[PDB]
Amino acid sequence: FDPALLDEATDLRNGAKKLLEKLKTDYFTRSPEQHLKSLAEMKPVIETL
């Protein structure tokens, strides 16, 4: 094999991992219903602002 290439492919795979984890923490740590509930909850404060 090739230690450089060997250790490089793993970097790419871990890149895919980080991308996915970022996507997850961004949008999918709460249900869409929870997200919408939070959003709706903030409405009176915006109206005051």
Binding site: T25, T29, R30, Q34
Partner: protein, 90 residues
């Protein structure tokens, strides 16, 4: 001053345990995960972990955090591993 006068001031000679800072504030928790009330309270609590300097002893850390059995502490910036020794990041 506290150590040098320790014997005279209150009775017996003492040994430097550590110097600790306590951050006085009302912290806001920034969580991406949904937290129950107990978990929130715990995070708020964690925000008050004291920075500073300690004396590396099982006895010293355990005295400062009697809850700590294994792992990291939420009061003092030190920890105990499974082996029991003070962990390096302390």
């Amino acid at each position: 001053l506290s150590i040098t006068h320790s014997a005279d001031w209150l009775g017996m000679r003492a040994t430097p345990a550590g110097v600790l800072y306590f951050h006085i504030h009302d912290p806001m928790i920034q969580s991406n995960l949904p937290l129950g009330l107990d978990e929130i309270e715990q995070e708020i609590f964690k925000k008050f972990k004291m920075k500073g300097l300690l004396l590396g002893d099982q006895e010293v850390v355990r005295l400062m955090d009697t809850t700590l059995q294994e792992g990291r502490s939420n009061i003092i910036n030190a920890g105990l591993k499974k082996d029991g020794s003070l962990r390096s990041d302390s």
